[PDB]
Amino acid sequence: PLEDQEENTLRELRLFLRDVTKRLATDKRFNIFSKPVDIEEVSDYLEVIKEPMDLSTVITKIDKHNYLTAKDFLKDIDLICSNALEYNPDKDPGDKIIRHRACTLKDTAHAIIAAELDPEFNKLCEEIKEARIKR
């Protein structure tokens, strides 16, 4: 009944989220963020970063029905960016590019979300998230 209409609305967001995540992942610049960080080159990511994230993990989380709101999905694109700034020093040019792309990834994601997605449509998602986190 109601739970019906609900999942039709979620399925729709969940579809959009795949398309944003495909767009960010094709982008040349965001390539370093499309894999999980390796611990071969980086022998200390996990001692420095307590919550790793990447774009392919986001992909799967979409299919795992983890993102109830666009805001939830941005919570994880946001964690991509803060992870980079928290890990990489910004003196070396090499270090700096990554830093740049992380801010850019974040800004790109938000602008897309800000521009393609109907404000009325978020409100519906959030009203569904608060419902499912109850009864």
Binding site: E41, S43, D44, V48, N88, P89, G94, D95, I98
Partner: peptide, 7 residues
């Protein structure tokens, strides 16, 4: 800060 990616 971490050691860096490239070294």
């Amino acid at each position: 800060c971490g050691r860096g990616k490239g070294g």
